[PDB]
């Protein structure tokens, strides 16, 4: 891709790991099982490697991310909307199958689309996220090969999953048609992998990148400390949700809530420099804001994304209806608040910005250009 940079593990450690901007996407580990492992959500190596340039640096979304150049390759066009990125349509939708609809986080659109793809042989693997049986609610990559395994991944986990680890697993297991689900950072990594001219890991076999809207993921220790403060054991939690200005924790005895602003202290450091709310680079991006309870907001972006929603609607696995202008605006508002606040974080770590001979602090950019 354009604006690509060569680098090795030392560059990754210098610019990402030790800069405190790793987002635990899992890409560097997914394609260097030979050396990289994860400790506390950041990659490490325990023995010297000898590659001149590595996929760890190339695939990382925090080393170099030329978003607009990537948009041109994926969509043929750059964005016209700064808050939401490039899209051809925004709708609201929900699954029609009652079991998917009851197990899904909101309307179960994601689970319904993946089930449609596997039922019609469009994919032979869905790289999603599941939950550990030993460590409660700890997300882990799930390489689903059955419609029942796809359903087992339904629901939001607000802790970060190294989901790309699942994509690397499916590409190494012989799957020929893969769909993956990812937060915006997962999507960025998947797109860096698919568009790389430095490495070929067979990512053309990934046919669908379904994005989730995301404001932030929570550090496990902080989140579970918060759960203990709410007097809730993680093993007793049936479902998490974020809505109505509230963090919702569902148990058999009922729902326990907490004002969402108090959850900010639980956010992962890596999420502080995230400049992408709506999964801008995905084929479709699925969320909750703007939609009614039990429904999903769905941004259509790529041609493959559009054909997927049309073919799913024809197959009657999802129900689709237009979204109101005031609803779309509520999506833009949340995107703007995330991007504006995190760009404030970005400019405190970023080096000087250079435009030909001119050099200024990124935060003072408008004093130079107006």
């Amino acid at each position: 891709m354009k604006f690509d940079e060569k680098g090795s593990i030392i560059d990754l450690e210098t610019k990402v790991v030790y800069s405190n901007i790793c987002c635990y996407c899992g890409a560097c580990g997914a394609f260097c099982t030979e050396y990289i492992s994860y400790e506390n959500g950041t990659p490490v190596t325990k023995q010297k490697c000898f590659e001149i340039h590595g996929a760890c640096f190339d695939f990382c979304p925090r080393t170099f991310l030329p978003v607009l150049e990537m948009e041109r390759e994926l969509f043929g066009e750059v964005r016209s909307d700064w808050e939401l990125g490039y899209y051809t349509d925004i709708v609201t939708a929900r699954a029609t199958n009652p079991e998917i609809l009851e197990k899904g986080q909101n309307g179960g659109v994601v689970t319904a689309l993946l089930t449609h793809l596997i039922d019609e042989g469009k994919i032979d693997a869905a790289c999603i996220t599941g939950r550990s049986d030993d460590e409660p609610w700890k997300p882990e990559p799930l390489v689903a090969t059955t419609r029942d395994e796809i359903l087992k991944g339904a629901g939001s986990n607000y802790e970060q999953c190294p989901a790309i680890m699942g994509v690397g697993e499916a590409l190494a297991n012989g799957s020929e048609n893969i769909a993956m689900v990812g937060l915006p950072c997962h999507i960025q990594a998947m797109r860096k992998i698919q568009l790389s001219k430095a490495f070929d890991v067979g990512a053309s076999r990934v046919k669908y990148a379904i994005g989730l809207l995301c404001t932030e993921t929570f550090d496990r220790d902080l989140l579970h400390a918060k759960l203990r403060e709410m007097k809730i054991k993680a093993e007793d939690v049936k479902k998490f949700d974020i809505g109505e200005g509230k963090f919702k924790v569902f148990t058999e005895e009922g729902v326990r809530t907490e004002k969402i602003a108090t959850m900010k202290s639980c956010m992962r450091d890596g999420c502080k420099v995230c400049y992408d709310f709506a999964a801008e680079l995905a084929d479709i991006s699925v969320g909750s804001i703007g939609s009614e309870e039990g429904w999903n907001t769905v941004l259509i972006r790529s041609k493959a994304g559009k054909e997927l929603i049309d073919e799913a609607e024809k197959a009657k696995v999802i129900e689709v209806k237009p979204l109101n202008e005031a609803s779309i605006q509520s999506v833009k508002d949340l995107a703007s608040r995330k991007k504006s606040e995190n760009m404030d974080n970005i400019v405190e770590i970023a080096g000087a910005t250079k435009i030909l001979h001119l050099a200024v602090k990124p935060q003072e950019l408008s004093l130079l250009l107006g």
Binding site: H53, G54, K197, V201
Partner: protein, 525 residues
């Protein structure tokens, strides 16, 4: 019993029952093949990791020289029985035996035992393993290719094989020089050297050539037969293809040089890895150069002088030309003989794959006695060369020993040590470097016919300055003499009478059969 590098040449000189595996470039691949039940090494050009490589194939290593012990126990004083027991039992992967008689007994007794114990082993990737390797390759933009001295397209070759086309990989076997650097920068841990070997297994197994054994010295009768035609030039020169196998583009290049010059009746002599590599190829009638041409030191013959130490016989042949044919004294008379060879003995060395420190000292000793040497493009890595400035008149002044006058001579040879990049540049250069100021009209005509034809064949155009080698019309190749005379007149502005077919002006110097060229004031009479 077969060898790699010069021990193989010297051993076949002792026994015509032994065989030669091949040159340095083939060493790692053959060892990795695991065909050898026992490996006995001595000194020089041995893979420094040979203990590792032997261990991997379960072949005991016998080290026989103190230049290379590899941390092994010195068992020179132990009984041959006790050494065999130790090696057979596996409690040591090799031994040092500095007594050659004992080393030989151990090796022969041990290879019979290990031959039985090593049956059932597999050393190269299987079909499935090969498939997993080429499929797992990430086609890295700049890893293995950057570590490879030849910049070979391993990644692209692997992906082609993963897509069902192994030809790209197979092509790399001969281009590869068996160094192993590629594998060390591959995080996937692909045994690239063995993957290329597997892809080329059919061609590797079909690598069956025929080479004449190292003949060593040139006979006095041969000096008397070629002396005059060589000095006058009607034998267009001695072409000495020697040196290591760090070639830029495979082992066939040296074969093509030997073939082209023997067909043109040069005296073609070879040594070391060059002699080996020229013997791997067969012409349309299925014959190796050593099978098709005689081994006499004569025009149109192919001669394996022998191992790298046998190179000295090439020097010796040129000295004997000065002593036997020119009746010069050689006793402690180096400068006079070297000046004789530089001014009258048309010759040129070629070390297309020059690599070692021994290759640098060989070239130095050949250069000092007055013989030019062309090397391959890797030869720039020696840092130093010896190059002439054909445009600087004062650099090409020689004395006519008849009266002490000074004569400006054509650049002959133009260079002393020079690196060329491609076979197609190198072959015309070699011919060019055989011109000598004492060539007679017939001899220059022979040499110029080949230089012009070879330039047209390989470069598609005559050299820009070929008229520098024309002193008279008799020097001109016969078949195109009239066209050359016109070219001299209309493209180079010479005064030529096309009607009389005579050159009036233009040549660098007048032809004088009695011109006694020398660089040495002390030879002025």
């Amino acid at each position: 019993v077969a060898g790699i590098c010069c021990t193989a040449i010297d051993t076949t000189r002792y026994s015509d029952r032994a065989k030669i595996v091949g040159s340095i470039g083939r060493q790692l691949r053959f060892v990795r093949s695991g065909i050898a039940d026992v490996i006995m090494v001595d000194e020089q050009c041995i893979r420094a990791d040979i203990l590792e490589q032997a261990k991997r194939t379960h072949a005991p290593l016998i080290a026989t020289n103190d230049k290379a012990l590899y941390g092994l126990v010195d068992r020179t004083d132990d009984s041959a029985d006790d050494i065999i027991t130790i090696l057979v039992s596996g409690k040591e992967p090799g031994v040092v035996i500095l007594d050659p008689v004992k080393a030989g007994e151990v090796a022969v007794r041990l290879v019979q035992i290990m031959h039985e114990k090593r049956k059932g082993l597999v050393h190269l990737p299987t079909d499935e393993e090969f498939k997993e390797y080429v499929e797992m390759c990430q086609n890295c933009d700049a890893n293995c290719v950057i570590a490879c001295p030849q910049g070979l397209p391993i990644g692209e070759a692997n992906k082609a094989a993963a897509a069902g086309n192994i030809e790209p990989l197979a092509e790399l076997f001969d281009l590869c020089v068996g160094c192993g650097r590629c594998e060390q920068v591959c995080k996937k841990h692909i045994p690239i050297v063995d993957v290329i070997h597997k892809a080329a297994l059919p061609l590797v197994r079909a690598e069956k050539g025929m080479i004449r054994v190292g003949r060593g010295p040139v006979l006095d009768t041969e000096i008397r037969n070629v002396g005059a035609p060589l000095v006058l030039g009607t034998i267009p020169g001695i072409i000495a293809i020697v040196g290591c196998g760090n070639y830029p583009n495979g082992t066939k290049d040296v074969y093509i040089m030997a073939k082209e010059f023997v067909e043109r009746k040069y005296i073609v002599v070879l040594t070391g890895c060059g002699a080996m590599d020229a013997a791997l190829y067969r012409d349309e009638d299925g014959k190796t150069l050593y099978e098709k041409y005689p081994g006499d030191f004569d025009g149109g013959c192919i001669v394996n002088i022998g191992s790298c130490v046998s190179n000295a016989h090439i020097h010796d042949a040129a000295i004997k030309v000065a002593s036997i044919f020119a009746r010069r004294n050689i006793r402690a008379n180096y400068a006079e003989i070297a000046d004789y060879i530089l001014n009258r003995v048309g010759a040129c060395g070629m070390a297309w794959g020059a690599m070692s420190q021994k290759a640098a000292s060989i070239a130095s000793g050949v250069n000092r006695i007055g013989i030019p040497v062309v090397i391959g493009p890797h030869g720039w890595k020696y840092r130093r060369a010896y190059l002439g400035r054909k445009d600087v008149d004062r650099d090409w002044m020689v004395y006519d020993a008849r009266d002490g006058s000074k004569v400006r001579i054509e650049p002959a040879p133009e260079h002393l040590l020079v690196a060329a990049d491609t076979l197609e540049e190198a072959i015309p250069l070699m011919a060019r470097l055989c011109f000598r100021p004492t060539d007679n009209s017939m001899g220059r005509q022979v040499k110029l016919t080949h230089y012009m034809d070879l330039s047209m064949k390989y470069l598609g155009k005559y050299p820009d300055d070929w008229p520098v080698f024309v002193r008279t019309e008799a020097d001109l190749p016969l078949a195109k003499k009239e066209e050359y005379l016109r070219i001299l007149k209309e493209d180079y502005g010479w005064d030529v009478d096309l009607e009389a077919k005579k050159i009036i002006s233009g040549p660098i110097r007048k032809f004088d059969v009695s011109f006694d060229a020398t660089n040495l004031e002390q030879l002025i009479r």
